[PDB]
Design a protein around this ligand. Structure first.
Ligand SMILES: O=P(O)(O)OC[C@H]1O[C@](O)(CO)[C@@H](O)[C@@H]1O
Ligand SMILES: O=P(O)(O)OC[C@H]1O[C@](O)(CO)[C@@H](O)[C@@H]1O
Lengths: 555, 555
């Protein structure tokens, strides 16, 4: 494994074993009035500012310099160029990795197999916009002449999470668009509950699937089509209510979808990096194409920042190395994402796939098994709610949990003259402050006494009211959560994930870890039919199956 | 500082560092045809069966024997009795812990300092039912005479999560109840977007708050009240549109809500254990009281199972110790909860509070600092959805992640003649099998050769196709997800949490870790006012506040 052999990494490791343990945030802040200044970065996008404050982290100039040396010696910069230049860095699949090309507004050429990719990219974007305009304008009618009122996206992986998260995040910008629904789970209640609120005459289904062979999506699509034709009665009417987003023309046609109703993307577009491609059709339909182009632009802006900025002032690089520090030196298993924005309620879930499916690996690009930790477990819920659910464990638990706090300065809903947002911001600020500062035995004791506690209560409560603090957090504050800023925020993390993948020398763009489950599932499906017990598996799988056959009857 | 010195704990520890890394699930099943039989328990509740299959765990009779010795060695049973008996086991607050009283269907007496609590418990249940009856029948009219069509629950944390999770999970049983909304975040966006869809004339607001002073809920409540009073203007109309669930009568009255409109509970009802009390009013309104009683009965059934079952056959006890095993011996930081049911999409979020806010502690009951791990980080998403998001990391990542897979045998929507559910069950089964069995290099190699891949391509890809397996999981299968069954499942985990807290000797029923953030938030709140720079905090908090003030009016 490259990482553990790297001299910059080893130097980092020994420093941690002989210093890291004594690092204390409160102390660091008390002895360096320039800490915020030295450990924060402000980005002016001309469309809002983004403040990345990483000063509340367990680091020093020395640690940062070492972390940055490591990034450099692991070839982060060269790796980045190869990605942008269209090289097939996805080594196990021999594929290019060009999600940056999907939002390359500069249209600077990017050649893969001797051919520039942009023309195809823009071609689909035009197709998307033209189609979106017709549906939005009402020009596009159903099989009964009615205009489309509901758009239903049926997809699962990177074919669901992104479009769902962004549409939720940008609701304030969906003024003139139809209602968008998202169906993904094979679980029947999902599609059933949806179709129950729809009129086939005014419903448009979007079959989103890179491969167009995923069982859940195809089954859901077929179910939606059956339900539809039950009323439309003429297979020819399908061309007015079903479109597909995929890279597989054959499967699409085989499904029965008109080829002009196919918005394609490419193999170098990873599912978990696809919302920027045709997969984002439901977004464009929801917020309009202008807002969608803003989304792409924001990501493009971030891509430029990542590409042209020296490492020491490079946002995604800084976040990545801060993560490496906690994962590989402090051994923290998780990474919490806590946005203080109800609209971003699906932000954390999106990066569970983005981050975990990318770096949840254990084999390097050379074929060697890692002998160090890789991708963390990403989780989180919107602020303040989380404060009333799990922060208890973050503040007084036994796990070190790196936290990323995000919040827009300006709210999309300044009700009560900004009272609500003022309180939201106060909590956002106070939480990272509290995690950092903590509360000593003495401070607690004085509070208890001042509060008028009796010698008994105080003595009883004292130890329980002590906060050891020293809990690291990142504070990412942006002027406003607009399509452009959101676009830049997502791209920022996409690049953080990329950097970490390079440091660990793993392929952040394949996902072989999903094959085993799929194949075993294919084996079990036919065995479930009938009441005959099964015994071709281990005793657990057999036992579970037999219980299912038995209880299938129970009334 | 109690568990680490327990004879059984140390014996358990020594065994692990001596054998722990030797355990291999695949080997354990390959050498014991009775494994499933010996490491699983079936529960017939008379209202459905629940199969807890814990055979795919890294354990043997010996390990389970030692784990159970630790359970009784730490006084789990005496502790259990104290809770049910009404003793003040919530030591730091000197309170009883009686959520089991809330659903005590047998009405056996349970006396707290003075009287038997059952009388007041049933008194509120009767009141809830009568009100619920009036609201659903249409008897209870809005201020202009219309029947109420929307019920808006306003609460946070324990006052929002249980209600939301249960109503989401029991959607199939609502037929007839008004639509229910849940407002919780202070973030203005939450109440703003909720109110924009309501008619003041037919909306009924439920202010859920145990203390009735939390800032988010009261603020949200005032905003709603103003909103309403903006179109009705008559303050006296409020009595037909606002009710309260709380233990604080004075504050409820001060808020402007009449007594008759207050559904109370008591201090021995922990917020994260309150959906069983008046807090469940929105659940009752949504699915009817018959179903609500069914929900309570299910919990009550599990309560009895927990109290009368020998430890080795006690479901919550087994789940608790397996957790202790992975937490304290394998050092696993997290617990994944993966229900293969879209209706349970909020189940994991619910227990993030129930578990994490309960056991995310570091001070024992004696006041000593723990020198071992406590509560884990709970997380998850409904399957198969997850299978396409983060399972990659669970299968080929670098972290051990204990996983609880849950699923109903019978679906609420058997569409397409059960095809969707069949596939859902197939994946449910195949995933734990895959996590267990893995796929060796030899197996992967055969596979690649059969695919006709040249030696070069084959060997470059081979290591990436290997699944080391040996990933432990629990499979919980129940006949159907009915109100009764959900209730038992929730109570089952409540008790798993109780047992673990007992073993760690922490107070699973207080939550002092949330106080610091609240104190600090009130401090900076007024400081946000004005354009003048703040310099009273650490440079980061100051820098963040000043960035906010600067961008507050940026265009
Ligand atoms: O869009 P598709 O091709 O149907 O993929 C479903 C999802 O599952 C995966 O193939 C693996 O889980 C993803 O990478 C993808 O986003
Ligand atoms: O408004 P309430 O019902 O008093 O409670 C606030 C919620 O937040 C907490 O106080 C702490 O997170 C919970 O214990 C509780 O359920």
């Amino acid at each position: 494994a490259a990482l553990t052999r790297n001299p910059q990494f080893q130097k980092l490791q020994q420093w941690h074993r002989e210093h890291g343990s004594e690092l204390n945030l409160r102390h660091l802040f008390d002895t360096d009035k320039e800490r915020f200044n030295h450990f924060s970065l402000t980005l002016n996008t001309n469309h809002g500012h983004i403040l990345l404050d990483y000063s509340k982290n367990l680091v020093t100039e020395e640690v940062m310099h070492m972390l940055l040396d490591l990034a450099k010696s692991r070839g982060v910069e060269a790796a980045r160029e190869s990605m942008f230049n269209g090289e097939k860095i996805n080594s196990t699949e021999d594929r290019a990795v060009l999600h940056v090309a999907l939002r390359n507004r500069s249209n600077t050429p990017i050649v893969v197999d001797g051919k520039d990719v942009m023309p195809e990219v823009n071609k689909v974007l035009d197709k998307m916009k033209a189609f979106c305009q017709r549906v939005r304008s009402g020009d596009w009618k159903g099989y009964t002449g009615k205009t489309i009122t509901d758009v239903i996206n049926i997809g699962i992986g990177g074919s669901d999470l992104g479009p769902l998260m962004v549409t939720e995040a940008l609701k304030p910008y969906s003024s003139g668009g139809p209602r968008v629904w998202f169906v993904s789970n094979i679980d029947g209640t999902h599609i059933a509950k949806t179709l129950a609120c729809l009129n086939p005459e005014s419903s448009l289904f979007i079959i989103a699937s890179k491969t167009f062979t995923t069982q859940e999506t195809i089954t859901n699509a077929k179910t939606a089509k059956d339900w539809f034709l039950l009323s439309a009665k003429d297979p020819s009417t399908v061309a007015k209510h079903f479109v597909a987003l995929s890279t597989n023309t054959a499967k699409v046609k085989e499904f029965g979808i008109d080829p002009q109703n196919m918005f394609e993307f490419w193999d170098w577009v990873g599912g978990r990096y696809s919302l920027w491609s045709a997969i984002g059709l439901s977004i464009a339909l929801h917020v309009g194409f202008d807002n969608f182009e803003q989304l792409l632009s924001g990501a493009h802006w971030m891509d430029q920042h990542f590409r042209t900025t020296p490492l020491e002032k490079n946002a995604p690089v800084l976040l990545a190395m801060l993560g490496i520090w906690y994962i590989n030196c402090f051994g923290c298993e998780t990474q919490a994402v806590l946005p203080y924005d109800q609209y971003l309620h699906r932000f954390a879930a999106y990066f569970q796939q983005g981050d975990m499916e990318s770096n949840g690996k254990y084999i390097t690009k050379s074929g060697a098994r890692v002998d160090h930790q890789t991708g963390p477990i990403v989780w989180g819920e919107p602020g303040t709610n989380g404060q009333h659910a799990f922060y208890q464990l973050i503040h007084q638990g036994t796990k070190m949990i790196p936290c990323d706090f995000l919040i827009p300065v300006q709210t999309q809903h300044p009700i009560r003259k900004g009272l609500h947002h003022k309180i939201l911001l106060a909590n956002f600020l106070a939480q990272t402050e509290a995690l950092m500062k903590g509360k000593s035995t003495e401070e607690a004791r004085k509070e208890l006494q001042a509060a008028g506690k009796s010698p008994e209560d105080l003595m009883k409560l004292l130890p329980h009211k002590v906060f050891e603090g020293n809990r690291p957090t990142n504070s990412i504050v942006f002027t406003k959560l607009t399509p452009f800023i959101l676009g830049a925020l997502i791209a920022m993390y996409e690049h953080k994930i990329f950097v970490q993948g390079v440091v660990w020398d793993i392929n952040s763009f394949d996902q072989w870890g999903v094959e085993l489950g799929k194949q075993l599932a294919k084996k079990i499906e036919p065995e479930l039919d009938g009441s005959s017990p099964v015994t071709s598996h281990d005793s657990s799988t057999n036992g579970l199956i037999n219980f299912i056959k038995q209880q299938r009857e129970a009334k």
